[PDB]
Amino acid sequence: FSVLNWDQVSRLHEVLTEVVPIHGRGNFPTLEITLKDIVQTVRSRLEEAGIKVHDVRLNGSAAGHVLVKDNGLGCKDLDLIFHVALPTEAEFQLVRDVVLCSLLNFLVNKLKISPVTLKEAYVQKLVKVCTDTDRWSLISLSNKKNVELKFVDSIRRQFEFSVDSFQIILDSLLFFYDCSNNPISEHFHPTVIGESMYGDFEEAFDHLQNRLIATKNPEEIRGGGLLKYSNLLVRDFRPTDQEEIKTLERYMCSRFFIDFPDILEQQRKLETYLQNHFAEEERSKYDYLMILRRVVNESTVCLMGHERRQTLNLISLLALRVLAE
């Protein structure tokens, strides 16, 4: 675990104070929100409702952009983590109430407003999870930049490459925003701690500067692991060693087909993926598909020959469509 220097701390302040437009599906106007503003409003109403917030973290590539500016992963993924306890289903409802309440805050035009109408205009994704170890709720906003409000009680420590496993604790800066008489300066700024959900922070930090692909948890890799790996490859990241990465590729491919046996379901996953990370980048769409096609063709085991040609055809035909339309 490391301490964010002034260069990193200052860049975090910009991200948290960056005005992000949220599209409104329907007649609803574009919301001019702010990462700092959302966190403050959400955490406040949560504390008021009787829900303690132990931590507010910053995940995604936004965290990586803070530690290393313009690292190659971009800064489109504005992910917020709220370490919040979730006992009864009632608390899950309160979380939804708070976010929708905070949505009402960033709006002066004539229109019908309700917690339902705000959901069907600003919310694009909603995930409820309450299992053995996994226990969290997720709310996303319209992407046209995408903000994801995640509320983690306890997670099974999901798999992610070391490059995008960074989380930055905002509590020290949230304290600063609420109780300061002077703006954040170089000679007077709060101490912000960044962490890595991978292992050694300094080891993951070196991977972000040298653009290295690595992981120590191949055991917990699931279906989406293949897509993340291809996303790193299309963004010019290289494996720590080409010898062992050949083993991972086979594992990622094998685990991909297990979670997505039906080709129709594969297409749904790919069509939805290409529109997320590469919305307005057609050549990046094609490049990503060709990277994926390379991995599947090389690392699909002989016994899975049927799914290979079936998927390679899906990838090829997917490319031919984005190459025409």
SS3 222: coil
Q: Which two tokens stand for residue 20?
A: 């992000």
In one-letter notation, the amino acid at residue 113 is I
Q: Which helix (H) or strand (E) holds 251?
A: helix 242-259
For residues 191 and 293, membership in a common domain is answered with no
Q: Could you say which of 213, 246, 265 is where a domain stops? A: 213
Owner of token pair 């990046």: 284
CB 29 within 8 A of CB 107: yes
Same domain, 89 and 163: yes
The count of other CB atoms within 10 Å of the CB of residue 301 is 13
Q: How far is residue 1's CA from residue 8's CA, in Å, rounded to a whole number?
A: 14
Alpha-helix residue ranges (DSSP H) falling in 123-241: 171-178, 201-209, 225-234
Supply angle C-alpha 156, 157, 159, rounded to 5: 115
Asked if 212 contacts 206 with a C-beta cutoff of 8 angstroms, the reply is: yes
Q: What is the DSSP string of 260-323?
A: --SHHHHHHHHHHHHHHHTTT-HHHHHHHHHHHHHHHHHHS-GGGHHHHHHHHHHHHHHHHHHT
- The 10 Å CB-count burial string (b at 16+, else e) for 154-172 is eeeeebbbbbbbbbbbbbe
Dist CA 237 CA 214 (whole Å): 10
* 230 and 84 share one domain: no
Question: Beta strand 135-141 with 123-130: parallel, antiparallel or unpaired?
Answer: antiparallel
Alpha-carbon span 136 to 81, nearest angstrom:
10
Contacts of 181 (CB under 8 A, 6+ apart): none
Q: Are residues 222 and 302 in the same domain?
A: yes
Given a contact cutoff of 8 angstroms between Cβ atoms, the answer to whether 118 and 103 are in contact is yes
Q: Are 294 and 246 in contact (CB under 8 A)?
A: no
The rounded Cα 242 to chain-centroid distance in angstroms is 27
- The pair of structure tokens assigned to 230 is 């291809």
Token code pair at residue 137 = 């709720």
Domain range for 184: 1-213
Domain boundary among 213, 248, 269: 213
Instruction: Give SS3 for 169.
Output: strand
* Domain edge (last residue) among 213, 245, 263: 213
Q: Residue 29 carries which DSSP code?
A: P
The b-or-e profile of 271-300 (16+ CB within 10 A means b, else e) is eebbeebbeeeeebbbbbbbbbbebbeebb
Phi, psi of 264 (to 5 degrees): -65, -40
The two three-digit tokens of residue 148, written as one number? 């994801």
Q: What is residue 235's DSSP assignment?
A: T
Q: Are residues 188 and 219 in the same domain?
A: no
Residues 144 and 290 in one domain: no
Phi/psi at 223 (5° precision): -60, -40
Strand order in the sheet with 77-84: 2-3, 193-196, 166-169, 53-59, 77-84, 146-154, 135-141, 123-130
Region label for 119, one of left (φ > 0), alpha (ψ between -120 and 50) or beta (otherwise): alpha
**Are residues 6 and 98 both part of a single domain?**
yes
> Are both 34 and 125 inside the same structural domain?
yes
- Tell me, yes or no, whether 186 and 238 share the same domain: no
Note whether 201 and 238 are same-domain residues: no
- Whole-angstrom CA distances from 173 to 66, 80, 104, 216 are 14, 14, 25, 31
Cα separation, 99 vs 226, in Å, equals: 32
Is the domain of 218 the same as that of 196? no
Under 8 Å between Cβ of 56 and 166: no
73, amino acid identity: L
Number of structural domains found in the chain:
2
Measured CA to CA, the distance from residue 129 to residue 106 in angstroms comes to 28
Rg (the chain; Cα; Å): 21
Percent helix, strand, coil in the chain, to 5, is 50, 20, 30
User: Quick check: helix, strand or coil at residue 152?
Assistant: strand
Residues 207 and 283 placed together within one structural domain of the fold: no
